[model samples]
Target chain A: ATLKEKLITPVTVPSNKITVVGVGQVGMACAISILGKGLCDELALVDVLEDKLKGEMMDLQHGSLFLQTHKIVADKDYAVTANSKIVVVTAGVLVQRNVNVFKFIIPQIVKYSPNCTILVVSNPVDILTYVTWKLSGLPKHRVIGSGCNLDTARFRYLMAERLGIHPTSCHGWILGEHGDSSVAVWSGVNVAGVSLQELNPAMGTDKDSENWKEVHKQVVESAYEVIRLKGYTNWAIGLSVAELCETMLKNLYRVHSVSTLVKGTYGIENDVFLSLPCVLSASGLTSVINQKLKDDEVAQLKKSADTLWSIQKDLKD
Target chain B: ATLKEKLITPVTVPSNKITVVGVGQVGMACAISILGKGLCDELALVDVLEDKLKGEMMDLQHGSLFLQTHKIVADKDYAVTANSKIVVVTAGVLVQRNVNVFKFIIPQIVKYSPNCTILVVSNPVDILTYVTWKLSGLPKHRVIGSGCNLDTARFRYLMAERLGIHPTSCHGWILGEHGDSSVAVWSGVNVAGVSLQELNPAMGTDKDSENWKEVHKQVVESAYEVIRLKGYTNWAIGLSVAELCETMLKNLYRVHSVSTLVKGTYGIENDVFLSLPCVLSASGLTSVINQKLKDDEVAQLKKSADTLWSIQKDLKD
Candidate 1:
């Protein structure tokens, strides 16, 4: 081939690099899970703690000896994270005091990799996602929060346990805040397309009878119980975030309860961030699905959104 | 429909059950990795320590709430493992003293699930695989060992690290023993069908100048270094075994270096076991590939076979 012809030819290189911005328990666990699944060709870890970062990198690097080869690097510098397709942030300030942290981190991320999609895994994810979107100046679809996706997994699991079916066969979602106020979409709960109430007549009866409220309570409180038992919760959330990464990286477009900016949905017009059944892809949140929820469930979603709206307002001020 | 007609009709159910024996670090890590990948619908954990078994089971069960729902159960009883499609054995005595343990466990496994395929991950895996094959009374293709698959991953990773390409794009295998006597089939090492030596002329020059022996030594010594740094090595081995299980369950029929009985190859005659490129499927190891290795590499493989032969002789008495 002539030089001129070769210069005009397009060359494609596989880009499967992911960066996790915190090497804490959740971040490390998520990294290991992602590595085990062979989700990316390269993984970079970033943390402020140099010692812990080096130790973690060494541990995972040695682990590469036992599995398929992938490049794993750790450093305090964000330059190591250049051209990452997805950057997962698990470090942040407290839920009530994260505005400053977002202001500090989002710009650094944008400055380093402006085209990368940001997956916010820090607590108060709903609010931080909004902060990240506004601060990074990225499209709303590019900023996502790991919200009630884990909660919905819990809800489906508990329902599957009660109904004696595989959880994958169960269909449901937990929307709105990822906190205690999250709304369980009971009307959408089904086993192989058959509603849960139809499969088990005893469920969702009167308040005194078997109902979803108890399951919702269990889903919300399970985190506390896990933290109470173990000093912290990592394995479940670790797996949850890895699942989200897989869904996005593989362009699965699966519906997950990820937090995104809500402009007008279910009569909630406030510009607040909350969990909804959003279709996720390599481009990040592609579209949000508006399932038909029971009137009570819609009311519950609005209430949860109101809680997040209030917190978001305080941050704005 | 008449009752007789209904009873006579054929029914099909999806069977994707997996059981792991010995919930030690490697076993439990493999279980957690498999669960995180959502490999099977049911997972059963077997361990002698009741309390630890329960704790690990609860931890993984709790993790299920944040991922896909799969049944995770721990038991001292092997009956719970009945009907498992694949049984992964990570439990056994030391390689020099595992004959009795194999004799004791193999029959129980056979009695409970005679149809299940056995995946042996116990160390001194070459000999143990032979023991598993003989004791289980199963077909030669029905038993496999976690052999140099992990070592091969290390080999590819090191090569790719030096070459600056993705490891998945590199093709190579570490054959023979999984330990110090393992043979690195340099002739078979290729990146996208281009020999490694061709890619880098400095490699394999005069056997001392950039030869693969140094890389092989590094791969062998990595385990000791990891155990020295951490009390034990788990993550990589866990992921490696999980990859094996995934290949078998998914029937990928991909060629991997797994320990299997060698009858007659390269003029070697012994009922010994060693790592070779084998085709794996749901039915277990389907066939072994006889890759053309350099004459010196072939000699190294024979030496490894002799090492395993010596170990096998002690078990016969």
Candidate 2:
């Protein structure tokens, strides 16, 4: 069922290649974003469903007419992903889909692109990311999970909606588990150098203050809301992966809230992975931002870590 | 049938807004490319099928969490497209569905957004473009069709493969119809300042001596090849619309081979619309490139114009 061109050997050149490890709705979403931006010299897709994968590649190859002209290949074999710069993993219903896919797929990915970074975009990402690090045996810095980054964007977007201003002007972070338990550092939230409290005296202050709680509450429920309206959440996570890849491939050294090994930071005692503001660059994650948080916010983040540890400890992988 | 939010009014500020008509594959593709690039402030979708249209808007709205934050609205009414700077129309079969849709839709589009440029992305694009100009009563420059742009890119891609160089370095033009009868202005093609004759003595000279004809053949067949392999062509056309919009919105004054009124240029006597190298900008299409083609190429181009005219003369609208 493979074309001879698909069987063509991978290039030996050190081109900036990206291999996406799935071709479902989310994976295809990420692939189109990558292709439209012309972000990589070559894009490869890996999936067991070679039929759809080949069709996706063909669809993308056809789109190259308007793209910057890059090669696209898809195959059931991991060799199609050989010599990649980064491999992105996208799976639906992350927990139920489970450690089964990434548990074994990581070795195949490493075998082909030994030096490539592995980025995970799955639910309960904090626990799943810890599994990626453990299974791939890559340095802690090289394994990442798209965590609070999407949440932060949602957070800023909600604030922008409330203020009738642009989201970029709304600064904030949603750190930790990337779930209901995640922390929104209200003290760190501001708009265009104007503190939220200044914008509204009741904003995130005193006695369960200000309808401000609604904004953070919206961030946590946004995904579920989207899934409720549509079928599932894919497009947002798809875009998040592209932005992360852009920062990595361009070595932009920008700070993004991604899940990484956070054992030594924030007074956490166990080796765990969770979302934090971390510096992203070509050298993988360079450092975690040491932003000061209020005492309660600190406890919320540490509690997320403890909860993640509890989940990680019970995993069969 | 409409949500209260969908009933929300449009902004009157002079911000950039784009409206896409039709939420089928091609239309959705264009929408995502535009969103991924964060190219505008607000995006609106219009379609008779409000059900899927609302779902699409919802999906894109959710993705805004990872985007630079733009508002998305979808409604069956053209009023949803008010104050748009540009309106992109995507129709599957240009000839049959068109003249009908554009005939009525352009008036609705012009009524709500009088000054907006109408860019057409449909088959038989050259003729459809002429119809758009006629029905909209817009300036000749304000109506465009994604014509030879995609073909030109495909031609450059084929040449790049033959030359083993980057496609961008393969300067070329596919001027005329965006179909089998399209003219490959090989006289306008070169690679990194090197003439095709220099690259290969048999390139396009010596009484049509070259295998170069095959490259253009591939350019014409690429669409059918893609449609055959997949289902129908959408992704490429999607990217094509985005690139066209970018060139127009940014006022880049970059030359692209889009379909426009080509009567004055290329010595064509009749008022026909076809592909030519035109400068795109905020002013819409500024000017057509007056590149001198050889006698044979000119004759071939005129022949394409004749064929397009024959088809146009039979149109019901």
Candidate 3:
């Protein structure tokens, strides 16, 4: 059983290459955020719009005069994305177009970067992530969707603001879908390791008066409000996805609620993608933390999963 | 009168409070970048536009769930900015309006946070920085303008691209004025401790045909080109200023070319404000690095300082 005695060849190390497969506003924002962190030594921007790609690349490159010595390349060719460690696909489409685009895009990505971990940021993310996994034939752990991470951030922020504490000092998760059906793991919510229920004894007594329900409602509607006000939502999500990339690139192994496959967890049947507190590393989602949930919380998670599973069934049909 | 040290009472340290005194595009970008870096535990947003400030604050707050526990507060009241350690002024105006604004704003900032270090990002930066020093009565070192830092970054990037090396591996500085008349300290330009002239012997032989002149010219013109193309340049400068904040907050005494008052250095007169290699600390600009320059570079720097000095005189008169 001593593997050291086995005749094994030297292993090839992966280069720190990050490829952003869309040069749109969100993708460009993610690129700039990544560059700001100095996370990777080389970044490749792949987009259909050659002019926009070049402009974004040049804009970023011009600022490199003030940043770390990271190489940024822009091209339509996936060959430029060769040997990438992580590929972030922000190229999105309507749900109806998901299958078509995923079929076309995933194969092209694997053709050039067979071993890279794929982070899907497109809308209908859970479904797109599932498609990406089926098409690219990557391991479930290696294919992730930027699911409710941003939602979770909103939840923690609102709670912290209400409690008048630092947001990072609070811990919570917005699980399942990235959208309306997302589940808030309220039973597991904690403030500096203390349960939220314990932190607010008065609220626990009279929950309706405290209006804690509004927090989740706000978290769900906040993005819409931002879009309605500012025309689009980018900065917060840009930072959120960048945080995910930083975690993986630095092998931080921090727990983030990212969308990944759930096959048998919590008695949820059929393969479905949903947000869970997954431990991430350079190799990708290393483990999922199965935090204890109350009976209702468990039901909420299953309901969210059911919604996605139904969508999956329809897609297959 | 070199006395031994005198006995002193215990000092009360201020928390890491960073205030961005504008909610414009560049300032907002800088704020997001700073939050991404987790540079400060507390961030205060001060702006005249109450609506914009609240909107930007809410947007950033929604993302706090994914970030370190940094408190972000937004308001039009300077009272909210009390006890700030560093105040970045991106509230810009035209050159003709510079003195009027500085006369009104600097004192108000000092009135709120007397000990805070001021980083000026407004245009006509040298004169504005000088005016800030005069009005706020803060030390010259503490009132820095984001001057040649971006330019130096551009210079290094261009040189690195030319030599096919990492930008950070190149050593250089763009001295004197932040705008036109800035001097590229070519004498100090080196790649990994080797001079660029030594690396490219052709550069030393036929500088004209190789077009080494294009580098600096491009550096100056690139900003205008970016503005022409994108309406305004924000991302690069935003990231650049964020990097400056990171350096100061983390007490990383890295040398950056920021605008500060310089008198009798390199034979520059009139207490002119210009860019020099300054070692930055949490306490602010700790010291200036007097890197040796070629005779012509020295002449160019002095000439640039003279241009700033003449502008300074006009403001005074």
Candidate 4:
């Protein structure tokens, strides 16, 4: 009954695999999620900090048995990561000019994996992704940063917590940076297909003590609170990494908040990299959503962009 | 193009909700995989260790924006987990039994989620699962254990490491207890459709240095090695839990190694829960694979069942 005489040859797309740069707690966190989802056949991890990198690689290899995967490998040479479909950079960041980690590491990655889409997870992700784009020589469209992806998740989560709805049904965004100054576009928030901004009530609302904007305030403080309590946060960002990876590998034509150069969108004139709700595909950022933002939201976004731009301009190539 | 007017309400089956009882290392590990894969609409975490559980729930809630999900919650009372589709028990075990955690917890979970499939992850898994079946009053089919599931994964992983192939294409199993007494079914081992046993030519064939059976030996030793290195093993088991959850919730209708009553299979007459390749589905285990096993394989399997049966007899209520 199960005999198949039909030809099952299928159309194909890009092959090879993902190369995860950095293997710290945060790096391993997303790597764990990526394998659990079986997003790809092969996965490679690299860390210039060779000991932890090699150790973490060994750990992943041991766990590889549980997932349906081809293999997991770690090596010093970028050649092993050659022909990678995508490269996730969770390595640390900071400090001036074209003299940082991205400046040095990105070129080797691009040399071996020229056509790869780069997803940056390093700190100062906005500035570093801009640096990544310049250093890697990839098309401006391809080099993307994690941006407010994690922050947006925190925002949606907080809104649902306050409003008593599932987070999945609440659409929202935290744009601009992956850090403070990221704009929470509350006007665009949707709950169960209902526009939150449209709801209005006059005197004596639900609670005299309630401040709805406190949700945004708490969203900003959530990361600090976690850092204070837990020493560091990895699980949340790991999930964001996994989400971004799925969107790229599976070519999910769904809108996600991520960093890309924002000169045309929102009439922002800076060549600054920032988070905007964009359709993330295998080719990386394809289109930014043109959803209308309130006047205040746009102003805040522009301010945030210029703030990031000043930092980028101060750095040397 | 004009969109057609359509009746779009969809047909649905039982709601997808999973309740994880115990928020310890192994429990949280699986939960990470579960949420990362976006496996269910609702997930509930239950633990008597209240503070950590509550905080962990909040943590995942913050991270839920990364994965599509309806909600997550935790409550002291089992009421929060009502109508759960599946329940994963990963608490500790030992000593005299009637006063055990499973005795106190299983009845409560089954009270609220009687129809749910029970996935046991505690140590002495085979025996405790037999106890779980007895206490649950659910059919033996529905009471499953994470028996050599992880061990089997390790086995396939080791085999692939030695033979050089994608681990996904390697068919293998470690049947019996999740521990030292488990039986590696090398006789049934398949590599890309090639039968390993059929190719044996012991006239100084493959290697004096290459002990093919040593792979299974190391498969057993692997757990200890990881435990020695990291002080515990989790990520692999976590992935195993995710794999088992996918099979049940999505009813993948595929074979996996898990602990179940081996009363009739392979002439195992003991009322013992032992690992065997079985079809795991939403209804739990629907069928056990009756794949051919060589004489030694069957003998070792029977011995493993009796050993488990003896241990079960020695344990309490």
TM-scores of chain A across the candidates, in order, are: 0.90, 0.92, 0.91, 0.90
lDDT value for candidate 2? 0.77
Residue pairs in candidate 4 whose N, alpha carbon or C atoms collide under 3 angstroms: A97-A316
Predicted complexes: DockQ each? 0.20, 0.21, 0.27, 0.27
Model 3 agreement with the true structure over B199-256: per-residue lDDT tens digits: 4444412255456767888888887776665456677777778889988988899898
Q: How would the docking of model 1 be graded?
A: incorrect
Compared with the true structure, what per-residue lDDT tens digits does model 3 show for residues A1-317?
21112212245323687888887757877887778777767888898776667767777887785555367888887888888888998887556587787787778888889878899887888888888888898998899999988888888888777666666877878888877778787677777676765544333122455556667888889878876655566677777888888899889999999988888897787798888999999999999999687677677678888887776776641
Could you tell me the TM-score of candidate 2?
A: 0.84
Clashing pairs in 2: none
- B1-317 per-residue lDDT for model 1 (tens digits): 12113222355222777888887757876787777666767888887776667656655665675544367877888886887778888886456577777777776777888778888888878888888888888888888888888888777777666555666767777889877888887777777677765545454434644465677787788666656644456666777787788888888998889988877896579887789999999998989998787788888788889878876777762
| B-chain TM-score of model 3 | 0.90
Q: What's each prediction's TM-score?
A: 0.76, 0.84, 0.84, 0.81
Off by over 4 Å in 2: A1-12, A35-41, A51-75, A91-96, A197-210, A228-235, A264-271, A290-314, B1-12, B35-42, B49-75, B91-94, B197-210, B262-272, B290-311
Q: How much does candidate 1 score in TM-score?
A: 0.76
Residue-wise C-alpha lDDT for candidate 4, range B1-317, written one tens digit per residue: 10011211233232789888877767877888788677877888898875667666766777887666667887767887788898988877353452387788889989998899999987778888888888789988889999988888877777677656556767777887666678777667767677665555321123433556677778878777766654566677777887899899999987888998888887877788888889999888999987577686678778877777775677667
Of candidate 1 chain A, the 10-residue stretch with the lowest lDDT total is A1-10
DockQ comparison, 2 vs 3, better candidate: 3
- Interface RMSD list for the candidates: 8.8, 8.8, 15.1, 10.1
